[PDB]
Design a protein around this ligand. Structure first.
Ligand code: A1IB8
Ligand code: ZN
Lengths: 299, 77
């Protein structure tokens, strides 16, 4: 009966095994509850902490209540939903609580998920450069061009792209419609990197079934403004099981951090060795559970 | 009035001519005209925040050259 909300379950598991998340929730719970001794956003922190406690006591030797908090903060969440969309709600309302509580560890979401992007545009006539700074919580990459590695997917996201034809860039220096090259580069790197694989497609909406060659260690340096010396590593993969984008069943796989992968199918847990799990992620295996969200933690 | 970029499902970037007072419904309608995706299937993410229907671009401080990310919903349960 638990797996009826596998969009909220699977996200709750990555967050539970997210480096420094539970400590962040309990720090904000103390401040929240002490002020209560001395509103629906307050409920989310209280509801989350109770769920964190519930998993703890069982593991030592609730997903429904979290959903009622969401039904007030969000009208739709009262059906099958998108796992990544729920991630925004939990990670967004926590920061909203923080922004209120800080005014009254307060950087729970900003220091853990948010990052900085530099969006540079180069007109091809005057060769001038314009820059933009935008925050990002996840890197939404494509899966198919219209075997390919995650390096290719991020390159399609961040490497120099040339907008031409019907999508011409309006240059204010030239005062005319012009060809431009766009290159988004990461400036500030959070401790948790989420990569949202756009496994959906359009023609007629379908789900792309072939995954990319997901690597265990990823270096986001080639698309960084600075010569970085830091790499990233997989610690969680949320997968979607199905053949259509309108229905399915989400699963999660979080690395033990001892050194294995727990597989979270509804209410079951099945430990998998490092080599077998990586094998099951290869495109040649034809994985029935297409990877949807990939999470990397700083080493 | 101002031009904003949208990164489609394949990573290809398209451009939209929008007003600061334009609502998210209007922006999603323009994206359909270029991409052929119904507005109810579209999710627009700007600066990590999802654009909610009924709000305006001035509410989210979307200025010229601002980049929106277009994603769909992958429902599961
Ligand atoms: C982390 O699970 C979750 N987190 C956040 N939300 C949720 C759901 C929203 C409620 C869960 C969640 N979902 C499904 C189930 C099913 N059973 N359980 C409890 C549980 C889970 C993992 C384990 C476990 N941990 C380890 C080790 F890593 F420590 F080594 C080994 N084992 C095994 C090998 C004994 C022990 C107990 C679940 N919990
Ligand atoms: Zn120019």
């Amino acid at each position: 009966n638990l797996g009826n909300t596998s969009y909220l379950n699977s996200i709750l598991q990555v967050l539970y095994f997210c480096p420094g998340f539970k400590s962040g929730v309990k720090h904000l719970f103390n401040i929240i509850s002490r002020k209560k001794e001395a509103l629906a956003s307050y409920e989310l922190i209280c509801s989350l902490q109770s769920l964190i406690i519930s998993v703890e006591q069982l593991q030592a030797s609730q997903p429904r209540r979290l959903l009622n908090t969401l039904r007030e903060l969000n009208p739709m969440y009262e059906l099958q939903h998108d796992a990544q969309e729920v991630l925004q709600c939990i990670l967004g309302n926590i920061q909203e609580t923080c922004q209120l509580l800080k005014k009254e560890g307060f950087e729970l979401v900003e220091k853990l998920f948010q990052g900085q992007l530099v969006l540079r545009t180069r007109c091809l006539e005057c060769e001038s450069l314009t820059e933009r700074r935008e925050d990002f919580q996840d890197i939404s990459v494509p899966v198919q061009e219209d075997m390919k590695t995650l390096r290719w997917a991020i390159s399609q996201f961040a490497s120099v792209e040339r907008i031409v034809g019907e999508d011409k860039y309006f240059c204010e220096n030239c005062h005319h419609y012009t060809e431009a090259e766009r290159s988004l580069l990461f400036d500030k790197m959070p401790e948790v990197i989420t990569i949202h694989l756009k496994c959906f497609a359009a023609s007629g909406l379908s789900k792309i079934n072939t995954p990319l060659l997901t690597p265990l260690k990823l270096s986001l340096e080639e698309w960084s403004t600075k010569p970085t010396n830091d790499s990233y590593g997989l610690f969680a993969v949320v997968m979607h099981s199905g053949i259509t984008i309108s229905s399915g069943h989400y699963t999660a796989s979080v690395k033990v951090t001892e050194g294995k992968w727990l597989l979270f199918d509804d209410s079951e847990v099945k430990v998998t060795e490092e080599k077998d799990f990586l094998n099951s992620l290869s495109p040649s295996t034809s994985p029935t559970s297409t990877p949807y969200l990939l999470f990397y933690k700083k080493l | 009035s101002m031009q904003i970029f949208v990164k489609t499902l394949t990573g290809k970037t398209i451009t939209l001519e929008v007003e600061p007072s334009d609502t998210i419904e209007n922006v999603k309608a323009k994206i359909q005209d270029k991409e052929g995706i119904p507005p109810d299937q579209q999710r627009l993410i700007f600066a990590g925040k999802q654009l909610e229907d009924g709000r305006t671009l001035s509410d989210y401080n979307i200025q010229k050259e601002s980049t929106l990310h277009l994603v769909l919903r992958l429902r599961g349960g």
